[PDB]
From Swiss-Prot:
Residues of the full protein shown: 27 to 506 of 784
Domain of life from the UniProt record: Eukaryota
Cellular location(s): Cell membrane; Cytoplasmic vesicle, Phagosome membrane; Membrane raft
UniProt PTM: Deubiquitinated by USP2. Glycosylation of Asn-416 is critical for secretion of the N-terminal ectodomain of TLR2.
Residues exposed to the Extracellular side: 1-480
Primary residence: membrane
Identification of the protein by name: Toll-like receptor 2
């Protein structure tokens, strides 16, 4: 019942197969037998497809596979056996897969990878995923023997009971290691074994409240780790300080991320300057998303973080209930160039303290997207302290109408006012602008002369008339989809002499011929410039298809 295309890609997915279909051929390049009910794979089921490159067997109900089932798949590059019922793995399955690049064994109920190294013959392996949520409980030294370099290694071990020291040490290089660990018990041992190989370590769902640092029993070496991320972790202010002590081993770390974590303030954590980490090495990017701090009144005089972020260039603290960045802290972020405080609780009065006289000295880009700002004039006035600011994003803030006169940072060339509920644009917006986004608002027209404007985004508004071409003599990009445009003045787009891209779709274009002639002809001569396709109101026919005699 399977169907193959002309390139040997065959689909046998979501059938009710209870066994590998018979009559497979050497012409098959890809076989998808996922979501079936193939309980057993025998000695000869896959012997005929010797040229197979891709074999997907996800979520079928495989519980038994004969040891030599893959003997003729010497050209196989992708094998997905994830989410099946394999409670035991056999080294025999992989012995003949010399061309294998991707192997997914995750989601099967085995407790360990077995007593025999499974991957020594997989010399070309690039991606390996293993483990499960409830049963994988031990990682052994023999587990990764034979593997030298991997682009991605994912180990799901939420129920881990034991990690044999040095298990991960035999791997020479790992570009991205993803570890699902529920407890911090083996973190020091694991960390010690990946110091020479891992370039990006990602730790998921780890409760690190009990984590405590101790120098590692390993020889000194230059670690290639550049990125470290924690996803869904639980920390205490004390354990966080302990984690920072690991930085001494990863001197090239440049980026750190904390997503969906929770930080608990002990309330007794009174560390001396001796045990407190105040240096952050070469970390230049810090990204925090959805951080939950239960009781902030349980933290001490957090001034150590001031010396911690002095060299950081990019900081993101998104959707974490931030309502204030104290002035003294802002003054210490001397190297900061990009600051994103999207989806927080910032209001003008507190932003005024956050952006005090010498705050964020080097700042070039400030994102205050989804906050509680109400006045564009007051916001611009407050930000005059940021002398080097060139880009400002205040989108998704509910602003009252803007006035005719406003003060803004002198170098500001980018301003995002998308989704701010504005009904009119006034001269509050400066002529220094090169990029303006006023999309998703309630605008009925646009008449602002912005001589240096290179990009205008005004999609999702209520314009019934295209803004005058003379308003943007050097415009490169115009986005005006989803408005209420029915026509355009003859020759208008040819007057946008620098135009490179334009979005005109989702508008009720009137394709009656003694009117749509110019637009249809322009679209035919400028297909490269159009993004999306303008369609006629009613028929839904592409505007370009219309030809007026
Ligand atoms: N005086 C007052 C007394 O309480 C302060 S007002 C409190 C404000 C201040 O919030 C601020 O100072 C935020 C300013 C924005 C920039 C923060 C950068 C911090 C990065 C974290 C270090 C990264 C190191 C990585 C190393 C590998 O928060 C507030 O506005 C109210 C409290 C809500 C939460 C605020 C954000 C919490 C920041 C915690 C930082 C540590 C996170 C650890 C995660 C595991
Ligand atoms: C961020 O913006 C600030 C703007 O204040 C930049 O700092 C300012 O840099 C200028 C030029 O280097 C300094 O002006 C100089 O003042 C002396 C007076 O002693 C004068 O003789 C010179 O002719 C010149 O006008 C100014 O003092 C300084 N502002 C401060 C901090 O007081 C800063 O360079 C920008 N950061 C980056 C990396 O873009
Ligand atoms: C002006 O600000 C706009 C509002 O933020 C911005 O549009 C938004 O751009 C982001 C970034 O791509 C989109 O985010 C999408 O991707 C993230 C991460 O994968 C998801 O979490 C989001 O749900 C979303 O799928 C937003 O969708 C998009 N908002 C919309 C609907 O417009 C503009 O790009 C900014 N203008 C300029 C010129 O930079
Ligand atoms: C891989 O298969 C070859 C087949 O000749 C076998 O000799 C070898 O032991 C297997 N794994 C190793 C150790 O390379």
């Amino acid at each position: 019942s399977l169907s193959c295309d002309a390139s040997g890609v065959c689909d046998g997915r979501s059938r009710s197969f209870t066994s590998i279909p018979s009559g497979l051929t050497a012409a098959m390049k890809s076989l998808d037998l996922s979501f079936n009910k193939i309980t057993y794979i025998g000695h000869g089921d896959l012997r005929a497809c010797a040229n197979l490159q891709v074999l997907i067997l996800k979520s079928s109900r495989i519980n038994t596979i004969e040891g030599d089932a893959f003997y003729s798949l010497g050209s196989l590059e992708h094998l997905d056996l994830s989410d099946n019922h394999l409670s035991s793995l056999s080294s025999s399955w992989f012995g003949p897969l010399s061309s294998l690049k991707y192997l997914n064994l995750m989601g099967n109920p085995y407790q360990t990878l077995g007593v025999t190294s499974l991957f020594p013959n997989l010399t070309n392996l690039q991606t390996l995923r293993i483990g499960n949520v409830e049963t994988f409980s031990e990682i052994r030294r023999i587990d990764f023997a034979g593997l030298t370099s991997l682009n991605e290694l994912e180990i799901k071990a939420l129920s881990l009971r034991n990690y044999q020291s040095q298990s991960l040490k035999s791997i020479r290089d790992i570009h991205h290691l993803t570890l699902h660990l529920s407890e911090s018990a083996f973190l020091l041992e694991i960390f010690a074994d990946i110091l020479s190989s891992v370039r990006y370590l990602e730790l998921r769902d780890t409760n690190l409240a009990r984590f405590q640092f101790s120098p590692l029993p390993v020889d000194e070496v230059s670690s290639p780790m550049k990125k470290l991320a924690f996803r869904g972790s639980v920390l205490t202010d004390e354990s966080f300080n302990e984690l920072l002590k690991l930085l001494r081993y990863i001197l090239e770390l440049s980026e750190v991320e904390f997503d969906d974590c929770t930080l608990n303030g002990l309330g007794d954590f009174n560390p001396s300057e001796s045990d407190v980490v105040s240096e952050l090495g070469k970390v230049e990017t810090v990204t925090i998303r959805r951080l939950h701090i239960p009781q902030f009144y349980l933290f001490y005089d957090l001034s150590t973080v001031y010396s911690l972020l002095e060299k950081v260039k990019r900081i993101t603290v998104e959707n974490s209930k931030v309502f204030l960045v104290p002035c003294s802290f802002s003054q210490h972020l001397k190297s900061l160039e990009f600051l994103d405080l999207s989806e927080n609780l910032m209001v003008e009065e507190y932003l005024k303290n956050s952006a005090c006289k010498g705050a964020w000295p080097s700042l070039q880009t400030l994102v205050l997207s989804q906050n509680h700002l109400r006045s564009m004039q007051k916001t611009g006035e407050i930000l005059l302290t940021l002398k080097n600011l060139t880009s400002l994003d205040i989108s998704r803030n509910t602003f009252h109408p803007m006035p005719d006169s406003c003060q803004w940072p002198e170098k500001m060339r980018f301003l995002n006012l998308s989704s701010t509920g504005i009904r009119v644009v006034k001269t509050c917006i400066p002529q220094t602008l090169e990029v303006l986004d006023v999309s998703n608002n309630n605008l009925d027209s646009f008449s602002l002369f912005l001589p240096r404007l290179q990009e205008l985004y005004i999609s999702r508004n209520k314009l019934k008339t295209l803004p005058d071409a003379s308003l943007f003599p050097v415009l490169l990009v115009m986005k005006i989809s989803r408005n209420q445009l029915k026509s355009v003045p003859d020759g208008i787009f040819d007057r946008l002499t620098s135009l490179q891209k334009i979005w005109l779709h989702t508008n009720p274009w009137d394709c009656s011929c003694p009117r749509i002639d110019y637009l249809s002809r322009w679209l035919n001569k400028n297909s490269q410039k159009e993004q999306g396709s303008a369609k006629c109101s009613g028929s839904g026919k592409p505007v370009r298809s219309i030809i007026c005699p």
